[PDB]
Structure formats: structure tokens, C-alpha cells
Amino acid sequence: AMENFDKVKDIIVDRLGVDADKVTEDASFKDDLGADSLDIAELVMELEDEFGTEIPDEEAEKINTVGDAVKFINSL
């Protein structure tokens, strides 16, 4: 699951512009990464492109941390 983690991290660092050292699995988007709902929408959409998966808001609203986003990938 290290693969999916790094892929999620990549998106957060070079596409959302967040420092890599802040991206840990327990990091909160709104509290730690300064990423709002629009940014999470961008993350989620980018994850649909990188895995050919569809993520409805029902599951996108359940992601408040890095581990949440990761966890979800590993479920596919």
C-alpha cells in the first residue's frame, strides 16, 4: 500500500502545491494542509483519472485526511 500512498502524496505535493514533509497519513486537509473542499474535489477528480475509478461525493465527503484518501484507493 506504499505505492498508493506515494501516488496520493504526489498529487497533493505537485498538483495542490503542499510541502511533501507535511503529507503524512494522519494529516488533516483543512487543518494541516490548508486544502479546502475545492482542493479535495481536485484531489478526488485526479484520483479518478489515475485509476479509472468513479468517486461520488458520498465517498469524497468521507475524506478528511491523507490516510482517508489512501485507504479509499486500497479498497479498489
Binding site: 505537485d14 498538483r15 502545491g17 503542499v18 510541502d19 511533501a20
Partner: protein
């Protein structure tokens, strides 16, 4: 017989650079020389990483205006005294870059011989 060939200046919005970088990482390889790419990759703070890139872009854009071939062939480095600089046979290129939180700028002055 002028001492200077031409002067150039460029002002650019950091956020516009960050935006393009984020949708097309390919911007790095297109704008920076391999030497510059290594230094760019040495940084861990994304803000500094984007400033640097914005600064180089500006410098090379201003260099083109001063000159009157290709961005990734033009190596901007720091000289003995820590001043940005470019090499180009026939001239001594003097460069200066300055950043703020939303703007990066650079000036270029080409003396000749």
C-alpha cells in the same frame, strides 16, 4: 560604439507559474537546463521551488528581449559573488532577480566587446 547591446526586464505572477506547473509538470524540463533542474529538485519547500522556476522563466524571457536558441539551453547560474549570470559568446551578461509572495522579476543587461 555603445557599451551595452540591450537591456531587458520581465515581471511575472508566481501563481500563474504554479498553476501551469501543477497541470503540466513538463514545464520544468521545457524551461530549465539539466543543471537548473538539479538545483530545482534540491529544494523541499514548494514555495521556494516555484519562486526559483518563476525567477528563471523571467530571467530567460528578459534575456530574449535584451538579446533582440531555447529556454532549456540557457543556463542561469550564480557566479563567484553569488550573482545570477548567463554565458553567451560576445557578451558579459549581468542578471538580477527579486521575489515577493506574488511576483518574481528579473533584469538583464548585455555588455558587448
Amino acid at each position: 560604439n555603445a557599451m551595452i547591446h540591450g537591456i531587458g526586464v520581465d515581471l511575472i505572477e508566481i501563481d500563474r507559474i504554479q498553476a501551469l506547473y501543477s497541470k503540466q509538470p513538463k514545464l520544468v524540463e521545457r524551461i530549465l537546463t539539466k543543471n537548473e533542474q538539479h538545483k530545482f529538485n534540491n529544494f523541499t519547500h514548494e514555495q521556494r521551488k516555484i519562486e526559483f522556476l518563476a525567477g528563471r522563466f523571467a530571467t530567460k524571457e528578459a534575456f530574449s528581449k535584451a538579446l533582440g536558441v531555447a529556454f532549456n539551453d540557457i543556463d542561469c547560474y550564480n557566479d563567484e559573488l553569488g550573482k545570477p549570470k548567463i554565458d553567451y559568446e560576445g557578451f558579459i551578461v549581468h542578471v538580477s532577480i527579486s521575489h515577493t509572495e506574488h511576483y518574481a522579476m528579473s533584469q538583464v543587461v548585455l555588455e558587448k566587446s
